[PDB]
């Protein structure tokens, strides 16, 4: 029954098995890289929080529009996603969460607007409809 | 099984059911190596509908109650056609697939889903 | 009918002029749709050219369906 | 004497150490900074920053917009985009980092499709042809 | 195909052509998924030269005399060696690939490209 | 020559002293190159250690090529 | 290797040794991919004791006495079981790995550790 075909198929599967092991090897290293890159952004935010807090507490005359809670009529979402698949159920779970949150906001009779980052989110919420305000694609690993 | 004997509607329902089952049989290989989340939304919907269809063909026979214990059921043709038309139309996408197992017509499915 | 492995050694000489002139588009559309059928379920992750090729190949494949006992002139 | 100067951007820290003096262009105008200064904060014009070491060597850092904060012992400069080079033409050296990172991001997508999505469909392509002839004695 | 019997330039040209073709055949899935834009600057020249080589293997058959024009070519081997050495080296890299189709020696492809 | 599965049960006792001494580096280089040959296609995020092993393995592999009728003493 | 044949203690000691070795094999790939520091402390102990076990399964042979000056050792039962029961309980966690290499019963292991 053409056993050489089955032998070739087994060889090809065993080759792809080697192919994926190396991709795992690389993904671990980039996870380490991004993990240590997350740390370098901390001092800037810390210093800015300190300065803003001191400035706002020392001069309590006025309240800025970003620090006061006004009644809600419309909300907004900034959705970040990946550019290519083959990464678990990351995007699917994130989109399920945001869809459930939007449905919960719908009963409050407040509509939503979006701003999408990453190709997967762009496609998903272009098919979903909604009120898009902007789109961005090809962010990369170390965005500027 | 041709339109000139069983009618147009029955033939269309049977062919649609077979098409859904065939596409699920073809997708069964990708979802094993890769995940269920690599597929598009239509393919996931087809997978769920095909599992529900596979469950819905189960039935308790009048003579098999010795082995299991549940009484047998005798489903007329009209009930089968009506149930499968609805299941293909997507009306029952909100019913968990465990409610289509070992039941008679489509009403038992809804009753069992409500009991759950 | 499986177009991938069905052949006819007589070929074009056994066709009327119009069908002989027209069958080239069908043959090449099926060839292109068959070369990359392995990615058919991954149309979301592809460029635009191959996605258009899939879009046309699916349509031409759907065109070849036909009922029974009703032949076409 | 000396005072702790930190120049940190939104991404990482650019410059650090102990310096004796600082020159920057605030919103009002140029500013001279020496240790023991009264607390102060401005917004920086897109111009270079000059810091004078105790030995006499003077480093220059290019900053395009940001917030300057000064305290009697520490100067913290928060810059939107800071590069350690000298001249005003540092786009000609920022382009090197831009090109390198863009090339890496390009080659990545060059490897994601080639390795993962290609092979992992080839493996799953033709399995069914083998499983059906499993029991045949011919 | 042995350097002792066919000389050294023949063998080297054949080996280079085979290498180019069998690398372009491997680039197929990547070209189909990503497109031609994201490939390196190298392996784009390979795609263009491989397409040109595939076109240049075309030949008009003398016995046909219909749809071709009785075009007996019977190109000497030296002409083909010169042509493929030039094509691999890159002297003809600027010519549209449609010129290399259905002609004999390089003089004919040059004439066809200049005419268009 | 497929170095992975080829074997000689006589082993070291069938070699001259110099080649017997020097063969270990070749054997281990081929082993290490064959273990991680999958990485040769990426060549982007290879750390310093494995890149050196790849560089040595490819060079040794290129070394073993040889023509006909030209034996080496 | 059944409790009815070799007694009770021997069976459990052997099964625990096999379990530790299996867990260490499951941990080595994680060590290779994700760094040594990612593991918890229990896995640190598992790795250390598994390496000690793998060393302790080595011993010199009487036939190697001609080739190598080390005399061969014939360690009986009720002496390997003691060593492995002590090793699996952490009782020897302060001994370096190298002391468990090419040696007989646990007493010579202690002596060689003393000489280290």
**What is the SS3 string spanning E7-37?**
CHHHHHHHHHHHHHHHHHCCCHHHHHHCCCC
CA distance E48 to E97: 8
The SS3 of residue D9 is strand
> Which structure tokens are listed for D35?
């240790």
**Torsions phi, psi for A66 (to 5 deg):** -90, -5
Looking at CA atoms only, how far is residue C73 from chain B in angstroms? 23
Q: For residue G105, what are the CA distances in angstroms to G15, G47, G60?
A: 20, 22, 12
Name all chains with 3 or more CB-CB pairs below 8 Å to chain B.
A, C, D
**Cα distance from A74 to chain B (closest Cα, Å)?**
29
**Which tokens in the block code for residue G12?**
């459990």
CA B73 to chain centroid, in Å, comes to 17
Resolution to 1 decimal, in Å? 3.1
CA distance E54 to E31: 17
**What is the Cβ-side half-sphere exposure of residue A120, based on CA atoms within 13 angstroms?**
20
CA A19 to CA E21: how far, in whole Å? Answer: 24
What is the Cα–Cα distance from D63 to D82, expressed in whole angstroms? Answer: 5
Q: Which residues contact G83 (CB under 8 A, 6 or more apart)?
A: G56, G105, G106, G109
| CA-closest candidate to residue G88, choices G60, G110, G56 | G56
Q: CA-to-CA distance for A47 and G105, rounded, in angstroms?
A: 63
Residues E54 and E101: their CA atoms lie apart, in Å, by 9
Task: Among G30, G33, G37, pick the best mutation site for testing chain A contact (most A Cβ within 10 A).
Answer: G33
Q: Residue holding tokens 């490819």?
A: F58
CA angle (C35, C38, C39) in 5-degree steps: 105
Measured CA to CA, the distance from residue B73 to residue B35 in angstroms comes to: 38
In DSSP terms, D13 is beta-bridged to D8
* Separation between Cα atoms, residue B38 and residue B25, nearest integer Å: 17
d(CA C49, CA F31): 43
Chains G and F are touching, with contact defined as 3 or more CB–CB pairs separated by less than 8 Å: no
Beta bridge partners of D51: D22, D59
**What does the block give as tokens for B84?**
């499968």
Range of the domain at B66: 1-116
Smallest CA–CA separation between A99 and chain G, in Å?
34
Q: Which residue has the tokens 């600057």?
A: E41
- Widest Cα–Cα separation across chain A: 87
Domain count for chain G, please give it: 1
Instruction: Pick the closest to residue D125 from E35, C3, A2, E29 (CA basis).
Output: E29
CA B41/CA A54 separation, integer angstroms = 50
Give yes or no for a contact between G96 and G114, defined as CB atoms under 8 angstroms apart.
no
Q: Return the closest-CA partner of residue A82 out of A27, A132, A24, A140.
A: A140
Catalytically active residues of C are: 9
What's phi and psi for B30, nearest 5 deg?
A: -70, -45
Residue to test with chain A: of B31, B37, B41, most A Cβ within 10 A: B37
- Breaks in chain D (C–N beyond 2.5 Å) sit after none
Chain C residue whose CA is closest to A124: C44
Kindly report the CATH number assigned to the domain that includes residue D78: 2.60.15.10
E69-E70-E76-E79 Cα dihedral, nearest 10 degrees: 0
Question: Which residue of F34, F36, F43, F45 to mutate against A (max A Cβ within 10 Å)?
Answer: F45
DSSP structure class, residue D62:
E
Question: Per the structure block, which two tokens stand in for G111?
Answer: 């002596």
Catalytic site positions of F:
9
**In three state form, how does the secondary structure of chain A look?**
CCHHHHHHHHHHHHHHHHHHHHHHHHHHHHHHHHHHHHHHCHHHHHHHHHHHHHHHHHCCCCCCCCCCCCCCCEEEEEEECCCCCCCCCHHHHHHHHHHHHHHHHHHCCCEEEEEEECHHHHHHHHHCCCCEEEEECCCCCCCC
- For residue D70, give the 3-state DSSP assignment: strand
Rounded to 10°, the helix B106-115/B77-89 angle is 60
- Whether E47 and E58 have beta carbons less than 8 Å apart is answered as no
CA angle in degrees (0–180, nearest 5) for A12-B21-A125: 80
CA-to-CA dists, residue C16 to C13, C21, C70, G47, angstroms:
8, 9, 21, 78
Rounded to whole angstroms, the Cα distance separating E5 from E13 reads 14
For residues C57 and G15, give the distance between their C-alpha atoms in angstroms, rounded to a whole number.
Answer: 60
Using CB atoms and an 8 Å cut-off, which of residues 11-50 of chain B contact chain C?
A: 27, 30, 38-40, 43
Between CA F5 and CA C25 the distance in angstroms is 50
Binding partners of D (≥3 Cβ pairs within 8 A): A, B, C, E, F
Tell me how crowded residue F11 is: count the other CB atoms within 10 A of its CB. Answer: 9
Count Cβ neighbours within 10 Å for each residue of E22-52 and write b for 16 or more, e otherwise.
eebeebebbbbbbeeebbeeebeebbebbeb
CB–CB contact E38 D106 (8 Å): yes
Phi, psi (deg, nearest 5) at residue G20: -65, -45
Kind plus residue range of the DSSP H or E element containing D6:
strand D3-9
State the Cα–Cα distance between residues E86 and E109, nearest whole angstrom.
Answer: 13
Question: Quick one: closest CA in E to D114, which residue?
Answer: E30
């Amino acid at each position: 029954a053409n056993l050489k075909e089955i032998r070739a198929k087994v060889a090809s599967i065993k080759s792809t098995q080697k192919i994926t092991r190396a991709m795992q090897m690389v993904a671990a290293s980039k996870m380490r890289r991004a993990q240590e890159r997350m740390a370098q952004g901390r001092p800037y935010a810390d210093n800015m929080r300190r300065v803003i807090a001191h400035l706002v507490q020392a001069n309590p005359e006025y309240k800025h529009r970003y620090m006061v809670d006004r009644p809600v009529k419309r909300v907004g979402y900034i959705i970040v996603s990946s550019d290519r698949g083959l990464a678990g159920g990351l995007n699917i779970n994130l989109f399920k969460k945001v869809v459930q949150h939007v449905k919960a906001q719908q009963e409050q009779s407040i509509e939503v607007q979006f701003a999408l980052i990453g190709q997967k989110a762009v496609s998903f919420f272009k098919n979903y409809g909604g009120k898009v305000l902007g789109a961005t694609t090809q962010i990369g690993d170390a965005p500027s | 099984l041709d339109p000139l004997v069983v009618g147009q509607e029955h033939y269309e329902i049977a062919r649609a059911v077979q098409n859904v089952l065939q596409r699920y049989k073809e997708l069964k290989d990708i979802i094993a190596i890769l995940g269920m989340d690599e597929l598009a939304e239509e393919d996931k919907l087809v997978v769920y509908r095909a599992r529900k269809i596979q469950r819905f063909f189960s039935q308790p026979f009048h003579v098999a109650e010795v082995f299991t214990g549940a009484p047998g059921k005798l489903v007329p043709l009209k009930e089968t056609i009506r149930g499968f038309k609805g299941l293909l139309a997507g009306e029952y996408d909100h019913i968990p697939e465990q409610a289509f197992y070992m039941v008679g017509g489509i009403d038992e499915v809804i009753a069992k889903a409500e009991k759950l | 009918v499986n177009a991938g492995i069905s052949v006819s050694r007589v070929g074009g000489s056994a066709q009327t002029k119009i069908i002989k002139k027209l069958s080239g588009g069908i043959r090449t559309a099926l060839a292109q749709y068959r070369e990359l059928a392995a990615f058919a379920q991954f149309a979301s992750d592809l460029d635009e050219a191959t996605r258009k090729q899939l879009e046309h190949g699916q349509r031409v494949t759907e065109l070849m369906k036909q009922k029974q006992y009703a032949p076409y002139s | 004497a000396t005072m702790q100067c930190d120049v940190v951007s939104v991404k990482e820290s650019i410059y650090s150490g102990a310096v004796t003096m600082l020159i920057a262009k605030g919103a009002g105008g140029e500013l001279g900074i020496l240790p023991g200064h009264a607390p102060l904060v401005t917004l920086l014009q897109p111009g270079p920053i000059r810091v004078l070491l105790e030995n006499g060597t003077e480093e220059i850092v290019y900053v395009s917009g940001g917030v300057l904060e000064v305290q009697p012992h520490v100067v913290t400069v928060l810059a939107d985009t800071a590069i350690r080079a000298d001249n005003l033409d540092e786009a000609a050296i920022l382009e090197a980092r831009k090109n390198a990172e863009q090339l890496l991001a390009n080659q990545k997508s060059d490897l994601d499709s080639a390795a993962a999505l290609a092979a992992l469909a080839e493996t799953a392509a033709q399995l069914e042809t083998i499983r059906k002839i499993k029991n045949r004695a011919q």
